[PDB]
From Swiss-Prot, chain A:
Function: Acts as a regulatory subunit of the 26S proteasome which is involved in the ATP-dependent degradation of ubiquitinated proteins.
Per-repeat ranges for PC: 7-41, 42-82, 85-117
Positions of transmembrane segments: none
Family as reported in the entry's similarity comment: Belongs to the proteasome subunit S2 family.
UniProt source species: Saccharomyces cerevisiae (strain ATCC 204508 / S288c)
UniProt-recorded name of the protein: 26S proteasome regulatory subunit RPN1
Range covered out of full length: 482 to 612 of 993
UniProtKB/Swiss-Prot annotation, chains B, C:
List of residues that carry (Microbial infection) ADP-ribosylthreonine: T66
Transmembrane segments: none
PTM comment text: Phosphorylated at Ser-65 by PINK1 during mitophagy. Phosphorylated ubiquitin specifically binds and activates parkin (PRKN), triggering mitophagy. Phosphorylation does not affect E1-mediated E2 charging of ubiquitin but affects discharging of E2 enzymes to form polyubiquitin chains. It also affects deubiquitination by deubiquitinase enzymes such as USP30. Mono-ADP-ribosylated at the C-terminus by PARP9, a component of the PPAR9-DTX3L complex. ADP-ribosylation requires processing by E1 and E2 enzymes and prevents ubiquitin conjugation to substrates such as histones.
Phylogenetic lineage: Eukaryota, Metazoa, Chordata, Craniata, Vertebrata
Phosphoserine modification, residue list: S65
Name of the protein in its database record: Ubiquitin
Organism: Homo sapiens (Human)
From-to range in the entire protein, with total length: 1 to 76 of 128
Known function: Exists either covalently attached to another protein, or free (unanchored). When covalently bound, it is conjugated to target proteins via an isopeptide bond either as a monomer (monoubiquitin), a polymer linked via different Lys residues of the ubiquitin (polyubiquitin chains) or a linear polymer linked via the initiator Met of the ubiquitin (linear polyubiquitin chains).
Residue positions, PTM ADP-ribosylglycine: G76
Amino acid sequence: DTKISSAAILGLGIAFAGSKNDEVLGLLLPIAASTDLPIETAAMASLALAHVFVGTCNGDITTSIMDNFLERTAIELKTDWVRFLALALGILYMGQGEQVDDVLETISAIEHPMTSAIEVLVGSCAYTGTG
Amino acid sequence: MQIFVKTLTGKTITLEVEPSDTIENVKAKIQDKEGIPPDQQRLIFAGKQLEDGRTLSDYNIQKESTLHLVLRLRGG
Amino acid sequence: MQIFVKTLTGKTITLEVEPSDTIENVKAKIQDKEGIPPDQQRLIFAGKQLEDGRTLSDYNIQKESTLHLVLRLRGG
């Protein structure tokens, strides 16, 4: 059934929910992209932040998350998590903002047609899509 | 020429360079502006990524060009 | 001064060091405390990874400084 994991992260999310402390992040980010430890507790964490920084998007984030879709590295393992990850990159922003438009420009500027699926996700959303 | 550098955080930088300038020289100028180490930088421009050594001329990078700068894949 | 070393998910170790202390030296103090060998350590601060040799003074690392102890292992 439900893995005690969700219950854990859930508590943390409600813990530093309203606290723009550069500490929690200084710990989550690494565990999410410290280029070492597995990618298990990593994926989840990534979402944890998204929930908090759901509104105000930081830099160190989009930076690591971005440098990931490209270099990826964090390859120690693999199974199924690109779904939740991609989702974050989407809600990563508030919604109405050409900011995302620029980002896509970066993903397009670089090869790696593997993330294509994503380009269609974020793209379809926000601007350039509806009609 | 005066080229711009847009970071993935939310800020731009106006650096005065030239065509003969080597990407390496640029990265250095940045390290002096902010504090990011060369071994930890990623410059992208309309075309692809700028490799070290080459010159801004190779990438036909003109003036007022926006350079997408991104840090290495880390956490902190 | 007394610097702190927070582990990704272990504990916050406190070590008495100085500004003239070399990173390598610090890593040694940690290896003596826990059991992690230097060739398997990685002190990260404000996202800026500290290299061996340098001193806690070069990074301006003052007292009660929180150092993010991270692990690493790559080469191929």
